[PDB]
Amino acid sequence: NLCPFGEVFNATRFASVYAWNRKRISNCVADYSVLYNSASFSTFKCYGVSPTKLNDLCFTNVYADSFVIRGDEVRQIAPGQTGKIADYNYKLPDDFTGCVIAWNSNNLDSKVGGNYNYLYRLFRKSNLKPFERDISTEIYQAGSTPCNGVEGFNCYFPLQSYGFQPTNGVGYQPYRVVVLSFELLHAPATVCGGTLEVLFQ
C-alpha cells in the first residue's frame, strides 16, 4: 500500500500527449525510499498549492497526468497558455491548482535515425476544454470540399509524429511531463490512522 510515485517518474514508457495518461494515486502511504533532487527535474512549479500536500493522502487523491512533448512546448503546460499542445492536446484550466513537473528525456525518447513513436494532434475543429482528452482519428476537413473516399487534397489525418533525434537542440528534444492535481475527499481514506522513524532507529 505504498504510493506508486516511483512508478510515475521512473516509468519505462510515457504516453503520447494527445492520448495523455492519467494515474490515480489514492489510499496509500508515502514511499520513504523514493527520492528526486534538483538535477532530476528541469521544472517543478506549483499553482495555488504547496507540494507538501502530496505527503498525506488521508483526505486527498492525487491524479498524475503524464506525456511527452517538445522542450519548447513545456511552457504551454501552464494556466492560460495557447499553442498546438494547449489548444489541441492537453489543456490546463485558468484556475489550475496543482503542480507541473518536467524533465529532459532525450536519453530515453530519442534514438539515432529518429524516434517517431510519440504523436501530437495537429488539427482540431475547436480547442479542448481543461482536462479534455481527444483520441479520435477522424479525417480533418481543412478546405471547403468535404472528405469522402480519397477525395480532397485538403483533408488531413489529424495526428502528427514527433521526430526526436539525439543531436537536436534542447528546445526540440523530448521532455517528459507530469501534472499533479488534487482531489479533496470528504471521508477519511482507509490508510488513515510510513513514518520518519523508518529511516532512523
Epitope: 482519428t137 479525417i139 480519397v150 487534397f153 485538403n154 488531413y156 489525418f157 537542440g169
Partner: nanobody
Framework: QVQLVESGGGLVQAGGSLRLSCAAS????EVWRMEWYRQAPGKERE????????????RYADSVKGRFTISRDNAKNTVYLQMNSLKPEDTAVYYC?????????????QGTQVTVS
C-alpha cells in the same frame, strides 16, 4: 542531411503516361504525410495528391481523380506519382513535399518538368 529529389518528368503525347519519383533522404517516408504539388504555366501551385503516414490513406485533387495514383515504397524511401491519361492541362513543374510540421527541425522547406503535347 535531409533531401527530397524529384524525377520522372518528360515530354509525352496527350494520353500517354509518366511516373514521377520523390526520393527522400534523412527521414523515413512513412512517418509523415508526403505530397505532390504542381505549378502550371500561368497558374499558382496546386496540391495534386498526398499519401498520409503509415496506412492512414491517400488524397487526390478532383482534376486528377481516376488518372493519377500516389504510392510509397518504404524500403526505397520513395513516394511515386503514376500519371495515366495525361492531358495538356497536366503540363507543369511537379514538386515533392514532406509535411513534417517543423519536426525536421533544421530542414528549411527543384522539381521535375512534365510537358503533355
Amino acid at each position: 542531411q535531409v533531401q527530397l529529389v524529384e524525377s520522372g518528368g518528360g515530354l509525352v503525347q496527350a494520353g500517354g503516361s509518366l511516373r514521377l519519383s520523390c526520393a527522400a533522404s534523412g527521414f523515413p517516408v512513412e512517418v509523415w504525410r508526403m505530397e505532390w504539388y504542381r505549378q502550371a504555366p500561368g497558374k499558382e501551385r496546386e496540391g495534386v495528391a498526398a499519401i498520409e503516414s503509415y496506412g492512414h490513406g491517400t488524397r487526390y485533387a478532383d482534376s486528377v481523380k481516376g488518372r493519377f495514383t500516389i504510392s510509397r515504397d518504404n524500403a526505397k524511401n520513395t513516394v511515386y506519382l503514376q500519371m495515366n491519361s495525361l492531358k495538356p492541362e497536366d503540363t507543369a513543374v511537379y514538386y515533392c513535399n514532406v509535411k513534417d510540421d517543423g519536426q525536421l527541425a533544421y530542414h528549411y522547406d527543384q522539381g521535375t518538368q512534365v510537358t503533355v503535347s
